[PDB]
């Protein structure tokens, strides 16, 4: 049966998805880690720059 | 043929696992560009350990 072959694929796409996901969950995660360090040594007119990135709604290149 | 409904709804799982990629990958990019704007005001003690942080190759907990 030809779909037979074919739910094999899926099935395999399917796992490499979920490995995918999980590797792109760890690059994330990375990243958050790095600012939450930094927001534990923030708490200087730098500084508070710093930290009104961190608290940004967005990624901080404009701050009101 | 069970085999069918099998295949519809493996090629939907497929495409949730995408969405979720494209999501992830967004906030990944979120983070990623917080850290990169925080760099671009530190181009200070304190500032030096944020810099430490930023170019460290884990997430910066202890900075030899």
């Known amino acids: 049966d030809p779909k037979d ?3 094999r694929q899926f099935q395999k796409e399917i796992e490499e998805l979920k490995k995918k996901l999980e590797e792109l969950e ?3 995660d990375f990243y958050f880690g790095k600012l939450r360090n930094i927001e534990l040594i923030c708490q200087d007119p730098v500084l508070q ?3 009104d990135i ?3 709604t967005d990624e901080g290149f404009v701050i009101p």
């Open 26 to 28: 760890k690059e994330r």
């Open 49 to 51: 720059r710093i930290v």
């Open 5 to 7: 072959a074919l739910l």
């Open 54 to 56: 961190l608290y940004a």
